[PDB]
């Protein structure tokens, strides 16, 4: 069961619904009236990194093992902070 997240530059990200629901904003939009979510102002380099976060969160949540650090390059940190705040994840 997959959903489609679309970036400002028209990149389509196909992710498991369970993964996309990690985002409070995406959960609210998918649970609302009238599947895809289109983000007019989040570019592909940011949205692809957000999808990697969803994969990481679902894999390592409730894990009894050592979990790795979620890595963030300095170059994307500010944009990713703004997107994480906007997307509630």
């Amino acid at each position: 069961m997959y959903v489609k997240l679309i970036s400002s530059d028209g990149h389509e990200f196909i992710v498991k619904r369970e993964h996309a629901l990690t985002s409070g904003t995406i959960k609210a939009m998918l649970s609302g009236p009238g599947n895809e979510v289109n983000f007019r102002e989040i570019p592909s380099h940011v949205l692809s990194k957000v999808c990697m976060y969803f994969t990481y969160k679902v894999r390592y949540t409730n894990s009894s093992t050592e979990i790795p650090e979620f890595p963030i390059a300095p170059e994307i940190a500010l944009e990713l902070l703004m997107a994480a705040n906007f997307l509630d994840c």
Binding site: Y2, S7, S8, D9, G10, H11, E12, F13, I14, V15, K16, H19, P43, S44, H45, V46, S48, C51, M52, Y53, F54, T55, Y56, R59, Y60, P68, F70, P71, A73, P74, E75, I76, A77, L78, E79
Partner: protein, 105 residues
């Protein structure tokens, strides 16, 4: 042992996982479920290397060290456009801006 993948064609990126022991053919069946093209209408690539249907993802170089949830490995996808395959084409993601002064050492 799970590997974490981005299956990429044109402006499409699929986020999924598979077993290191699972085959290229089995990954094509995953793609068929999502993008509705059968395995014989798909080519899968690691960089510019065409992957043989028989090989496991591990035998292709997709391991848990190189294909992590937080840093997935890229698999290129091309569709059979007629009797022949389209060229492998993956549109690059956008680029971040210059690092601001206050975020430099």
């Amino acid at each position: 042992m799970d590997v974490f993948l981005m299956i990429r064609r044109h402006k499409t990126t699929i986020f999924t996982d598979a077993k290191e022991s699972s085959t290229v053919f089995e990954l094509k069946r995953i793609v068929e479920g999502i993008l509705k093209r059968p395995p014989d209408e798909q080519r899968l690539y690691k960089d510019d290397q065409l992957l043989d249907d028989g090989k496991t993802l591990g035998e292709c170089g997709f391991t848990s060290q190189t294909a992590r949830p937080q840093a997935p490995a890229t698999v290129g996808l091309a569709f059979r456009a007629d009797d022949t395959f389209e060229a492998l084409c993956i549109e690059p993601f956008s680029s971040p801006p210059e690092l601001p002064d206050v975020m430099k050492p």
